[PDB]
Every structure is written in structure tokens, then in C-alpha cells.
Design a binder for this molecule. Structure first.
Ligand code: NAG
Ligand code: GVV
Ligand code: GVV
Length: 338
């Protein structure tokens, strides 16, 4: 069980002005810290944010949050469920800003909602330093779906924040699960992000911002575009036939669709060729790292917990690989798929 703490700085808020927070379970005999970012789509104007507030309110407010949360997958403390980091300090950061963890805008007279995803991460880190994070050796910033993209947008800023606070010794790294998307042609969305960024006053990494410049920062929400600008080590997990990707592509089997799906897999694999730390099975699914049975999937005989342990050691190893991308071209040609 992870225990809830609302932010002491009550000016850092969820969408409706309620305080943000984090769930925490300490492990005093460990110097490893895992901060995990929840996912759950987003909203990009007044009308569809109002809709989200009726039926997805826990993603917009902390007023109904429970006081505890059970750790699962990589957030589990039992070695049988989490062979990778079962003894680490666990943090679950709920997604209540609807901004893909990019916003830095307060609720005001001109703003019905607050979008403070980028500032929530910074404040969580800042308050955790007083509860044990000051002595860490590694801070792994992880996340799934919208949280995965949020890892890519924020990992370097967390490194920069800790350097400027006087903690150069803490090693900051990223783990992006199911947040690596392609701006491909649909079978039958870039505007939504561009409109959202203006709505949220969203921010992107600076390298990436200086490459693409004004009006074009939506490009930095796409993994294959923002990854080469990052300096912190980042491990990328992505299903080759992601359900969220296919949904936006309006895919729900004849030649046309066969060639479409086969081409999606080949392009995704291409974008990962120069990503040295990656795990990409040929499956139709979405998210993995906090699922309880995340130990079952394997690429070329290597599980995801093993690949992550090999990454720890790397920071070329005999029989302990870090780059694992399937080569077969159809969903669930890998027998270990969910
Ligand atoms: C609380 O957070 C806000 C937004 O980041 C910041 O302006 C303010 O200075 C913070 N308060 C304290 C006491 O640090
Ligand atoms: C689950 C929410 C979601 O998918 N958000 C999202 C949208 C566009 C891009 C490029 C990356 C993203 O992470
Ligand atoms: C080229 C038109 C377009 O926007 N395509 C697109 C498809 C899927 C996702 C997730 C994001 C996308 O941007």
C-alpha cells in the first residue's frame, strides 16, 4: 500500500483548483527512488474539458481520492511480482492536469481550469527531498501512456532542477512506457496538441524547442522527434501495434488494412533502431509496467524486468541485452503477447 500526501504548497493544483499530491511507500534500506506518472488522455478546450469533468473527475480533481493505493507491477514491493526494483522507494503521482504533464498555467479570472502538470512534477520532487530523496543514488522517472510522453518532456528538467538545488550526485533517468507515437497517415490529431499547448501554456524541452521554434512545439510531443535532444538516459517500451495509436488511426482483414498494419510496425521499428535501451514486442496492447503480469512478456527470450536490470548494469554485456525489438510483422507473432 502506498500512502497519500497532498502537496503542502496548495497553489500547485489539479484542474479544478484542488491540491495535487503523491502516494508514497518508503524503503529506508534503499537509495533507489521510483516516481511513476499516471496516464489518461487529455482535454484541449473548454467544451471537452467540461465533458471530462462530468465523467472522468478523478483525473481533474483530488476531492475524491482514496487515502491508499496498492503498488502493482514495477510499483510492487514483492520480488515475485517485481524482480527489477522490489526494494525501492515507491511514488505514484496521479494525473489530474489533463495536459500530458506539460502545463504551467494557474486557474484565474481568465482560465476556468488550471493546467500545472510540469509544475506538479517539480513540486513533488521538491517536497520529497525532505523525506529521504536527498540521499538517493538513482531517481527513475517512469510513466505509462500520457505518463510515458510526460517522462520524455520532463526527465531533463528534473535533472536540471536537482543540479541547481545542490544535488549533482543523484542520477536521474527515464522509463517511457507506451508514450512513443507516430504522426502517420490515418487509415480513414496534430491540431489537438497544438491547440492544447496554447490552452495549457504548455512547455517542452529547450533543445527540442530551439530546433522547431515558435508555433511548432507540438513536434516535441512525438518520441522520435524529442528523444535525440535529451541528455538523460531513457529506456523506451512500446508495443509495435499500440491500441491507442491504432484508435487514433481509426483502425478497429483485407489487403489495404493488412498493408497498413504491417507498415505501422515497420515504421515504429525504424524509429527505434538507434535507441540503445528499448523493449518493443509485436503485440496489440497498451501499457505494461504497472500491470501485475508484466513479467510474462519476452522478446528474443528476455523479459522486460531482465532488460531493465541489464540497463542498470550497463550504466556490451554477455547474455544480458538492453535493445530488444521484434522483427516479425503481425500482431501476436510473438507467443508471449498479452
Ligand atoms: C509554490 O509553488 C508555486 C508554483 O511553482 C511557486 O510560485 C511558489 O513560490 C511556491 N511556494 C513556495 C513557498 O515555494
Ligand atoms: C493517453 C494520452 C495520450 O496519448 N496523449 C498524447 C497525445 C499525443 C502525443 C503525440 C502523445 C501523447 O502522449
Ligand atoms: C498526420 C496526421 C496525424 O495527426 N496522425 C496521427 C496519428 C496518430 C497519432 C497518435 C497522432 C497523429 O498525429
Amino acid at each position: 500500500d502506498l500512502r497519500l500526501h497532498l502537496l503542502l504548497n496548495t497553489s500547485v493544483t489539479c484542474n479544478d483548483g484542488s491540491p495535487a499530491g503523491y502516494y508514497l511507500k518508503e524503503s529506508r534500506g534503499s537509495r533507489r527512488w521510483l516516481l511513476f506518472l499516471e496516464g489518461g488522455w487529455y482535454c484541449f478546450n473548454r467544451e471537452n474539458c467540461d465533458s471530462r469533468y462530468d465523467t472522468m473527475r478523478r483525473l481533474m480533481s483530488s476531492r475524491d481520492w482514496p487515502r491508499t493505493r496498492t503498488g502493482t507491477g514495477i510499483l510492487s514491493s514483492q520480488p515475485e511480482e517485481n524482480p527489477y526494483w522490489w526494494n525501492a522507494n515507491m511514488v505514484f503521482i496521479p494525473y489530474c492536469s489533463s495536459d500530458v504533464w506539460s502545463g504551467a498555467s494557474s486557474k484565474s479570472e481568465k482560465n476556468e481550469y488550471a493546467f500545472m502538470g510540469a509544475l506538479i512534477i517539480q513540486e513533488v520532487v521538491r517536497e520529497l527531498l525532505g523525506r529521504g530523496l536527498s540521499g538517493a543514488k538513482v531517481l527513475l522517472l517512469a510513466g505509462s501512456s500520457a505518463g510515458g510522453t510526460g517522462v520524455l518532456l520532463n526527465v531533463d528538467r528534473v535533472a536540471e532542477q536537482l543540479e541547481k538545488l545542490g544535488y549533482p550526485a543523484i542520477q536521474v533517468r527515464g522509463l517511457a512506457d507506451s508514450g512513443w507515437f507516430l504522426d502517420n497517415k490515418q487509415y480513414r490529431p496534430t491540431e489537438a496538441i497544438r491547440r492544447g499547448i496554447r490552452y495549457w501554456n504548455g512547455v517542452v524541452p529547450e533543445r527540442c524547442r530551439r530546433q522547431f521554434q515558435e508555433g511548432e512545439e507540438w513536434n516535441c510531443f512525438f518520441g522520435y522527434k524529442v528523444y535525440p535532444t535529451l541528455r538523460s538516459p531513457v529506456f523506451v517500451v512500446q508495443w509495435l501495434f499500440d491500441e491507442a495509436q491504432l484508435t487514433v488511426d481509426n483502425v478497429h482483414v483485407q489487403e489495404g488494412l493488412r498493408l497498413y498494419i504491417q507498415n505501422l510496425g515497420r515504421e515504429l521499428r525504424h524509429t527505434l533502431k538507434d535507441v540503445p535501451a528499448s523493449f518493443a514486442p509485436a503485440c496489440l496492447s497498451h501499457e505494461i509496467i504497472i500491470r501485475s503480469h508484466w513479467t510474462d512478456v519476452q522478446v528474443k527470450g528476455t523479459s522486460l524486468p531482465r532488460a531493465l536490470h541489464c540497463w542498470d548494469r550497463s550504466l556490451p554485456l554477455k547474455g544480458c541485452p538492453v535493445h530488444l525489438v521484434d522483427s516479425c510483422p503481425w500482431p501476436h507473432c510473438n507467443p508471449s503477447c498479452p
